[PDB]
Motif scaffolding. Structure first.
Motif, PDB file in Angstrom:
ATOM      1  N   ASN A 196       1.150   0.698  25.215  1.00  0.00           N
ATOM      2  CA  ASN A 196       1.495   2.084  25.058  1.00  0.00           C
ATOM      3  C   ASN A 196       2.515   2.560  26.131  1.00  0.00           C
ATOM      4  O   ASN A 196       2.219   2.516  27.319  1.00  0.00           O
ATOM      5  N   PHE A 228      -6.592  -2.262  28.855  1.00  0.00           N
ATOM      6  CA  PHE A 228      -6.393  -1.138  27.957  1.00  0.00           C
ATOM      7  C   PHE A 228      -7.380  -1.387  26.809  1.00  0.00           C
ATOM      8  O   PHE A 228      -7.221  -2.352  26.050  1.00  0.00           O
ATOM      9  N   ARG A 242      -5.177   7.434  22.538  1.00  0.00           N
ATOM     10  CA  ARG A 242      -4.416   6.390  23.220  1.00  0.00           C
ATOM     11  C   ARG A 242      -3.695   6.894  24.495  1.00  0.00           C
ATOM     12  O   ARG A 242      -3.537   6.157  25.436  1.00  0.00           O
ATOM     13  N   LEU A 261       0.287   4.864  15.520  1.00  0.00           N
ATOM     14  CA  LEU A 261      -0.831   5.730  15.939  1.00  0.00           C
ATOM     15  C   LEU A 261      -0.757   7.034  15.146  1.00  0.00           C
ATOM     16  O   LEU A 261       0.321   7.549  14.886  1.00  0.00           O
TER      17      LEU A 261
END
Ligand SMILES: Nc1ncnc2c1ncn2[C@@H]1O[C@H](COP(=O)(O)OP(=O)(O)OC[C@H]2O[C@@H](O)[C@H](O)[C@@H]2O)[C@@H](O)[C@H]1OP(=O)(O)O
Ligand SMILES: Nc1ncnc2c1ncn2[C@@H]1O[C@H](COP(=O)(O)OP(=O)(O)OC[C@H]2O[C@@H](O)[C@H](O)[C@@H]2O)[C@@H](O)[C@H]1OP(=O)(O)O
Ligand SMILES: [Cl-]
Ligand SMILES: [Cl-]
Ligand SMILES: [Cl-]
Lengths: 318, 318
Positions: free
Chosen positions: A11, A68, A284, B133
């Motif tokens: 991310n 993560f 996230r 996402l």
């Protein structure tokens, strides 16, 4: 500034925040062959997914691995513990999101909502009429939770409000809960018709959901897996669906992701998701922040925020 | 044996059970032109969907219309009430099912679960990697219920367990509930970011969800309709989605089913279902039974089980 390695994809929020305190070193894949001599002073790793041991062991000054995800089965924690390396994960910040996904997968499996939407989208409603009635429903069901930690408990809370009976199986029971405890997985399965798998990917849970467990679940049985693919005997599940030994299944996780066995793709009573349990921008982003904040807390105070149970370490520096 | 007309399609469970007390008369569509002179002694009707007035008025000895569904907007109840004809519907037996569907549709809208399943099925997970996402999440949302009867209340109870703030709008408030009442729809819409429509298809609610309501909902706004299509101004909704006036929508019902406007099919942030809220075998069996049991109770005791509010009638045997 300590130097933090980030191997493969992560991310961008992690990357954006690392410069608050660190120098970032990137390699395009989690592969020891990409490590150069200039990288030997790396003190930490931030990673999503697999950390192969040879990569981890390329770094003599490695202090911390920030994983993560709540699941950290891609990191060899025994080898990290043996080297005095702290491992952190990302619990709590994703608990409610994962629980929501579990419920949505369950409802989609039972009521075939994604198939109904395809029916409409393909123009079928207009000419062939109503989507067929779903043979299954949540109404009247009894749900057994295999695992009951932060996420399992959050799923149970949602399920109580849907008017279903709740049971659970864990190695040791939990005091002060109104849900029926079962000392065995097979025993819980006999009692329930809906089994939700929400345990870590450990050696202890490997292929725990097997032919016998499915057989006990029964012909109205529905399996939901939001834990780890390795926990379900994928071959026995395929056979059980073929034979009508169980009625349906919903799976967010698989033995060898991102590969899904062709046989699972053929069933009309199965819902499949590509490991999306925490996969919203907001959740996230919170996970990304926790990875970074763990690294910042370690290097600045010597105490991580969410070290894993196998590594309750404090930083030693000269 | 009283003679019961069944026009067009209905659940076979109704047709299987009518012979317990009745003689069944079938016509292939709800059309007055299919009525023959031999059918003028019909005492009752069992119907799913529209009952046109000329069909209803073909039968001088008609006593009761038993509607399949909680919604009875296809029956002209004013004209039935004026003729002394009792109308029954099917509440309660579908409440929990419709509530489950509402939650599933909301989760699918927010988290894009059906698109994610397509991404997997189409082979994208293997070739391109992770599904993107979802920009939205249920986390941190505030939900406004437009309507709060049996179904609205059942949806709220589920939502409490998902940790979201709950508000509602009805013509008159409900005492003894911890949810925030809003005296206006627009006012509720300003205060919330997620609007669930669950009201009857009446004149009062016609196009109530309009440009202004959507505009107040805001740019993170999500509209869920599980009530009737006529309540949403379908044109204004299309415009609002196009302009990014709202973030997404999930719809189980449409102005002119089974037709869905092509523009709604094009949006990636919309989930569409072909009116499946009650559409499980178990719930439709319970609905079927209630239609029949209403007719049986009427003709045997003179009291229906679930007459609608507009027709609290008792049988007079002519
Ligand atoms: N061999 C086992 N047999 C039965 N239950 C097991 C076994 N191993 C573990 N669990 C349970 O799993 C639960 C895990 O809860 P947490 O540690 O709080 O984690 P969380 O609920 O956030 O996530 C669980 C898993 O969710 C997955 O996404 C990911 O792979 C992760 O490991 C506990 O109730 C834990 O309960 P316990 O320690 O066995 O009493
Ligand atoms: N003009 C209106 N403005 C605002 N709210 C309205 C309006 N008309 C009705 N409602 C509300 O809708 C709710 C309806 O509740 P129930 O009669 O118990 O019906 P249920 O919850 O079972 O089903 C509602 C609709 O769900 C649809 O699937 C189907 O077409 C059906 O008509 C009540 O809270 C009813 O509340 P109230 O009578 O207005 O206090
Ligand atoms: Cl991500
Ligand atoms: Cl996960
Ligand atoms: Cl039906």
């Amino acid at each position: 500034r300590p130097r933090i390695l980030v191997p493969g994809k992560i991310n961008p929020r992690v990357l954006e925040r690392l410069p608050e305190m660190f120098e970032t070193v990137r390699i395009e894949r989690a592969d020891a062959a990409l490590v150069t001599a200039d990288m030997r002073d790396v003190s930490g790793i931030a990673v999503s997914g697999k950390l192969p041991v040879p990569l981890m062991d390329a770094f003599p000054s490695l202090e911390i691995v920030a994983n993560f995800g709540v699941g950290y089965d891609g990191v060899d924690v025994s080898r990290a513990a043996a080297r005095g390396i702290v491992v952190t994960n990302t619990p709590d910040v994703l608990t409610e999101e994962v629980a929501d996904t579990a419920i949505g997968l369950l409802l989609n499996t039972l009521r075939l909502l994604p198939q109904a939407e395809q029916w409409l989208r393909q123009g079928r409603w207009v000419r062939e009429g109503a989507f067929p009635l779903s043979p299954l429903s949540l109404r009247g069901r009894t749900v057994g939770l295999f695992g009951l930690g932060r996420i399992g408990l959050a799923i149970a809370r949602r399920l109580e409000a849907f008017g279903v009976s709740i049971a659970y199986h864990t190695r040791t029971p939990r005091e002060g809960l109104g849900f029926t405890y079962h000392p065995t997985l097979v025993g819980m399965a006999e009692a329930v018709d809906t089994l939700i798998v929400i345990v870590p990917g450990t050696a202890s849970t490997l292929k725990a959901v097997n032919a016998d467990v499915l057989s006990a679940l029964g012909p109205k049985g529905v399996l939901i897996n939001v834990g780890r693919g390795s926990t379900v005997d994928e071959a026995a599940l395929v056979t059980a669906l073929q034979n009508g030994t169980i009625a349906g299944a919903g799976l967010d996780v698989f033995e060898n992701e991102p590969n899904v066995p062709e046989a699972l793709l053929s069933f009309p009573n199965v819902s499949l998701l590509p490991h999306v349990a925490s996969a919203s921008v907001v959740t996230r982003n919170a996970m990304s922040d926790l990875v970074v904040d763990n690294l910042k807390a370690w290097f600045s105070t010597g105490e991580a925020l969410t070290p894993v149970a196998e590594t309750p370490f404090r930083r030693r520096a000269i």
